[PDB]
Design a protein around this motif. Structure first.
Motif, short mmCIF file in Angstrom:
data_model
loop_
_atom_site.label_atom_id
_atom_site.label_comp_id
_atom_site.label_asym_id
_atom_site.label_seq_id
_atom_site.Cartn_x
_atom_site.Cartn_y
_atom_site.Cartn_z
N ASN A 23 0.86 -1.18 0.00
CA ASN A 23 0.00 0.00 0.00
C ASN A 23 0.90 1.23 0.00
O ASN A 23 2.11 1.10 -0.16
CB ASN A 23 -0.98 0.03 1.19
N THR A 25 2.09 2.65 2.20
CA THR A 25 2.93 2.63 3.39
C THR A 25 4.27 1.95 3.14
O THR A 25 5.31 2.62 3.14
CB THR A 25 2.21 1.89 4.51
N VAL A 28 4.37 -5.63 2.32
CA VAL A 28 3.77 -6.57 3.25
C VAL A 28 3.86 -7.98 2.68
O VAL A 28 2.95 -8.43 1.98
CB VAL A 28 2.30 -6.21 3.53
N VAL A 63 5.67 -7.20 8.01
CA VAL A 63 5.18 -5.87 7.65
C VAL A 63 6.33 -4.91 7.88
O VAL A 63 7.45 -5.33 8.18
CB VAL A 63 3.93 -5.45 8.46
C1 LIG Z 1 -0.89 -1.70 4.61
O1 LIG Z 1 -1.34 -3.04 4.35
C2 LIG Z 1 -1.06 -3.97 5.41
C3 LIG Z 1 -1.61 -5.31 4.96
O2 LIG Z 1 -2.14 -6.04 6.07
C4 LIG Z 1 -1.67 -3.51 6.73
O3 LIG Z 1 -1.23 -4.38 7.77
C5 LIG Z 1 -1.26 -2.08 7.05
O4 LIG Z 1 -1.95 -1.63 8.21
C6 LIG Z 1 -1.58 -1.17 5.87
N1 LIG Z 1 -1.22 0.20 6.17
C7 LIG Z 1 -1.99 0.99 6.92
C8 LIG Z 1 -1.49 2.38 7.16
O5 LIG Z 1 -3.05 0.59 7.40
#
Ligand SMILES: *[C@@H]1O[C@H](CO)[C@@H](O)[C@H](O)[C@H]1NC(C)=O
Ligand SMILES: *[C@@H]1O[C@H](CO)[C@@H](O[C@@H]2O[C@H](CO)[C@@H](O)[C@H](O)[C@H]2NC(C)=O)[C@H](O)[C@H]1NC(C)=O
Ligand SMILES: *[C@@H]1O[C@H](CO)[C@@H](O)[C@H](O)[C@H]1NC(C)=O
Ligand SMILES: *[C@@H]1O[C@H](CO)[C@@H](O)[C@H](O)[C@H]1NC(C)=O
Ligand SMILES: *[C@@H]1O[C@H](CO)[C@@H](O)[C@H](O)[C@H]1NC(C)=O
Ligand SMILES: *[C@@H]1O[C@H](CO)[C@@H](O)[C@H](O)[C@H]1NC(C)=O
Lengths: 159, 247, 125, 113, 33
Positions: A23, A25, A28, A63
């Motif tokens: 994502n 971020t 993962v 992660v």
């Molecule tokens: C990005 O994706 C992962 C997939 O599980 C998740 O754990 C993570 O919280 C996501 N990023 C945000 C900011 O939620």
């Protein structure tokens, strides 16, 4: 737009598979038994991830223009990933040149693989696939130790 | 802990297991190893370790072993006949036994047929001893199948609660998994001293280098393919491995 | 903690309720009961009637015609009515508290565990 | 039917002494699915009911002196009362639900010597 | 027929070790019936 791949034999439950996602971020990696959408993707509010609908029995977690090459292979229960990020001076066409790919990851999974897919970020508000065969090459090493040129020894009589 | 009729099951996985802190802790009243004697555990590697946990009486720890019989090994928890792991057990009178009787620790005392090894059965159907059908109500020859240890702190040993953990090392057919810790030691540069650099075994004099690897390369080779440089894993410096002195 | 209350001297042929007043426990959970007993003097004892937790009633087949029990978990009692009095039933009449019939290979029903005391019965006009 | 034949009748056991009572079931009363005997020993005090002393033939009831203890095997079933106190002028019974009718011990005179 | 000893020696060939000092540290003994 390219937001990772998904691997495996059946891409569903009843057998295990890998899932590599990013994502906005960060990466993962994940290994469970999933239930994958037959057309899985993620949106762009900026709410997303219609990728799967199941995350059972997870046996591994983790992660945390541009040209982005990757080599994926899977030997003796290890899933190796090499990669390289070169900057093009085009937007979306395959260029010409030489650039060796450096190893990134190593995962002692054990997973069987026969199929894979891709993941894309939709519109709400170009990629290639080669395959690898057993060849014999001649690599030229620099004095710093980098591969600068190569010869494929089964192309033509000169090689 | 967990009951004896629904034991737990933790699947220890890829890590660094140190069975020495277990073996020498001297707090365990029973530490038997079957497939493999205990001191050689910190020198082997398997695919998976499972750990099962439960609580039994004091004198039923002798039925947690390959090839036994009794109300526990028959139908509560059965160990296969070629077991490989180890069985650990220690007294826990002060934690699990309470005045007036701790009636929260049950066990199964009736079943149709003995368990298969590592099989588990948490059902609660009314058992039927005689031929008469039961229809889900108690009565003669229609018994509830679970009883409860009433543990009390003034019980003679052999009636006080013991906690048990059964480690079972298994080896499917993967590429590798958990193993015991390695070793270590200092580095003496300049002196034909035997060496091992995380796998590279050799002999020779070690000397400070002035070459520059790429930051993923471990050791360097010569033409004719002999190791002549290494990188120290801890400090990450290149050292020339010149063969020993001879003539 | 059971105790059998009841009249001491009786007269023949009529029906007769019997009260084992207890305490210390209830009587409607899986594994509980109370069995009723007599013994004429010099004889060994004779259990008469029984009722379990979801009211699983037992009686002797000989006086199955005359014995009729019911448990009183609320009163911590048991009512057992009983007909057709005769002088060979000159007995003292006991109750005994059943517990976990899984243990049931030890007493021939004659006893049990709890056991109150007994109300005497003599058949005389 | 499995008759329970006592051991010592007019027992003239001295004070504080081992009084023995055997019980001979005519058949092997062992429910083999227990690995543990069942038998219920009883004490009729005169004018009083018999009260349960030891169930399982090895698990003494609450508030009972452990100077009484149960034993026995197969068809022979003894009672290891280690000391006969002055409170022990009583009548005793042994029985089995592992039957059909109300089998009984017969009852013993406990004279204290 | 009390065979089956366990030791430190690892017994270089054709030598035999006879002694009893315990591997107890629950308890162990270098002999088995
Ligand atoms: C990005 O994706 C992962 C997939 O599980 C998740 O754990 C993570 O919280 C996501 N990023 C945000 C900011 O939620
Ligand atoms: C492995 O652990 C050792 C310590 O156990 C690390 O050594 C440290 O290295 C840094 C250099 O960046 C020093 O500032 C510290 O003082 C060192 N610690 C000690 C106790 O000497 C070593 O760096 C670790 N390995 C890696 C690859 O980081
Ligand atoms: C995998 O998941 C299924 C369904 O959740 C479950 O039945 C199975 O036991 C799981 N695998 C293991 C090894 O527990
Ligand atoms: C992968 O699939 C093949 C199918 O031919 C199977 O034989 C093999 O066991 C599978 N891999 C593992 C690690 O089980
Ligand atoms: C890398 O190689 C170049 C050319 O081969 C050289 O000039 C340089 O000194 C080397 N080392 C670096 C850039 O650290
Ligand atoms: C001689 O002594 C050694 C002591 O290390 C002993 O092991 C050996 O058995 C002895 N020789 C014989 C023939 O027993």
């Amino acid at each position: 737009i390219i937001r990772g791949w998904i691997f495996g034999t059946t891409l569903d439950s009843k057998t295990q598979s890998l899932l590599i996602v990013n994502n906005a971020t960060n990466v993962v990696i994940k290994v469970c038994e999933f239930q994958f959408c037959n057309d899985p993707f993620l949106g762009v509010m900026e709410s997303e991830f219609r990728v799967y609908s199941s995350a059972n029995n997870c046996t591994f977690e983790y992660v945390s223009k541009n040209l982005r090459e990757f080599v994926f292979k899977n030997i003796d229960g290890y899933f190796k990933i090499y990669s390289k990020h070169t900057p093009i001076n085009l937007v979306r066409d395959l260029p010409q040149g030489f650039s060796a790919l450096e190893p990134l990851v190593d995962l002692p999974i054990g997973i069987n693989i026969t199929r894979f897919q891709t993941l894309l970020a939709l519109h709400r508000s170009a990629y290639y696939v080669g395959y690898l065969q057993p060849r014999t090459f001649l690599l030229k090493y620099n004095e710093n130790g980098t591969i600068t040129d190569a010869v494929d020894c089964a192309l033509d009589p000169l090689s | 802990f967990a009951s004896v009729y629904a034991w737990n099951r933790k699947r220890i996985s890829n890590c660094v297991a140190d069975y020495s802190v277990l073996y020498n802790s001297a707090s365990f009243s029973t530490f038997k190893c079957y497939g493999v004697s205990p001191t050689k555990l910190n020198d082997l590697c398997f695919t998976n370790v499972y750990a099962d946990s439960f609580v039994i009486r004091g004198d039923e720890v002798r039925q947690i072993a390959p090839g036994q019989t009794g109300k526990i090994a028959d139908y509560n928890y059965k160990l296969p006949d070629d077991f490989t792991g180890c069985v650990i057990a220690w007294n826990s009178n002060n934690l699990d036994s309470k005045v007036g009787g701790n009636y929260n620790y049950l066990y199964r005392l009736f079943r149709k047929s003995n368990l298969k090894p590592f099989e588990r059965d948490i059902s609660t159907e009314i058992y039927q001893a005689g031929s008469t059908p039961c229809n889900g109500v108690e009565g003669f020859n229609c018994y509830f199948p679970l009883q409860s240890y009433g543990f009390q702190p003034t019980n003679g040993v052999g009636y006080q609660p013991y906690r048990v953990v059964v480690l079972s090392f298994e080896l499917l057919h993967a590429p590798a998994t958990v193993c015991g810790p390695k070793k270590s030691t200092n580095l003496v540069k300049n002196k034909c001293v035997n060496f091992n650099f995380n796998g590279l075994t050799g002999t020779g004099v070690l000397t400070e280098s002035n070459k520059k690897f790429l930051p993923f390369q471990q050791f360097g080779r010569d033409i004719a393919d002999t190791t002549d440089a290494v990188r120290d894993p801890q400090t990450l410096e290149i050292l020339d491995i010149t063969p020993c002195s001879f003539g | 903690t059971l105790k059998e209350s009841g009249p001491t001297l009786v007269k023949p042929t009529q029906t007769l309720t019997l009260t084992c007043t207890f305490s210390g426990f209830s009587l409607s959970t899986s594994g509980v009961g109370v069995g009723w007993i007599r013994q004429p003097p010099g004889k060994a004892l004779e259990w008469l009637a029984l009722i379990y937790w979801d009211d699983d009633k037992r009686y002797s087949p000989s006086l199955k015609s005359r014995l009729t029990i019911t448990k009183d978990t609320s009163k911590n009692q048991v009512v057992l009515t009983m007909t057709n009095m005769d002088p060979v039933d000159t007995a003292t009449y006991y109750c005994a508290h059943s517990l976990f019939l899984t243990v049931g290979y030890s007493s021939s029903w004659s006893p049990f565990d709890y056991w109150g005391q007994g109300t005497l019965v003599t058949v005389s006009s | 039917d499995i008759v329970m034949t006592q051991s010592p009748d007019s027992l003239a056991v001295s004070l504080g002494e081992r009084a023995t009572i055997n019980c001979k079931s005519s058949q092997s009363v062992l429910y083999s699915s227990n690995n543990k005997n069942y038998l219920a020993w009883y004490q009729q005090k005169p004018g009083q009911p018999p009260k349960l002393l030891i169930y399982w033939a090895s698990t003494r009831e609450s508030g009972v002196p452990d100077r009484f203890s149960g034993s026995g095997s197969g068809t022979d079933f003894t009672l290891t009362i280690s000391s006969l106190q002055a409170e022990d002028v009583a009548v005793y019974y042994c029985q089995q639900y592992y039957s059909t009718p109300h089998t009984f011990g017969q009852g013993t005179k406990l004279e204290i010597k």
